[PDB]
Amino acid sequence: GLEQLEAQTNFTKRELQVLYRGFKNECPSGVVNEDTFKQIYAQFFPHGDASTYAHYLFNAFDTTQTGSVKFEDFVTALSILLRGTVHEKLRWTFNLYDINKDGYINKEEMMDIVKAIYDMMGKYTYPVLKEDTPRQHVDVFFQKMDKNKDGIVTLDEFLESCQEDDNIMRSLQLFQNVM
Amino acid sequence: MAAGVAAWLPFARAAAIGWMPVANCPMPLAPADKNKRQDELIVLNVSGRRFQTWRTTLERYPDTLLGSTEKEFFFNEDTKEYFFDRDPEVFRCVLNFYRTGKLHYPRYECISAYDDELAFYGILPEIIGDCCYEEYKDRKRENAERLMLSFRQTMWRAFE
């Protein structure tokens, strides 16, 4: 219910109704799926292809195991992603990086996500493009989010070395008060 | 939050998060907050008839009359309702487009009135939803059709 969704999320009533308006304005509140995000998520990012990344945060987004979850489960995570706490954003990004759905990630798995990022960056890189640094930008990533040097990340191990990245600290909640 | 043209920016502000931890780059850009206020159902009075809609729904296309800011030549502060002395039934389609973003054609309209009201509100008769397009051209062409010396050339004119 409307009130049943308010007390769950952090947003307010005006925000929730004015957003459900735009929610229905593109999909008749049936349920949002892959194909609608691959165009909403792309319609704000020219010179790039945003489908491949939405393909990950949609399955991390879907609380159920269906191919299209809900509007209620849409807002219950929109709250966490906009005004939610930092450490919950980190856990949800943990659910996102873990493509194998287990809680255990190897090099190529999360490298496939850093591809999507650096793929939708553009067709021609504005500085010089180097394709082995996607091997290294995850490599230099490893030495941070790993204290065992085995090749796997678990939630605590994957978080215990981003908690002090102050730039991502002030940058992860930039939209928790801007309406 | 935002609506009108920014109806789906919240999903973007949610999805931006997924690059923040992996942002091994020194410094991204802080947000662009500003003054804040909610929308309101602006109320149009077209010839006694009343319509209402959020202001962002108006601002969606400022290349029109109401979409722009110059609707105030008809804003009656005496009423606080923008009053227009045009037909509302043809304006009804315009409003509905403003809501949806596509226009259509009431088949039984004397195409003259439809077109000149379109022009009146600054609308493009070309961007009609092609789902209803050719009949518009048919009305166009049928209406177009509907609206359709001493001695030397004396014999001439006498001939034809």
Binding site: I117, M121 | A6, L9, A16, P28, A32
Partner: peptide, 18 residues
Amino acid sequence: SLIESQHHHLLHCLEKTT
């Protein structure tokens, strides 16, 4: 314009590839 600000900001925060 107050719209190019927000939309351009997202692509700016995107540019952070090294």
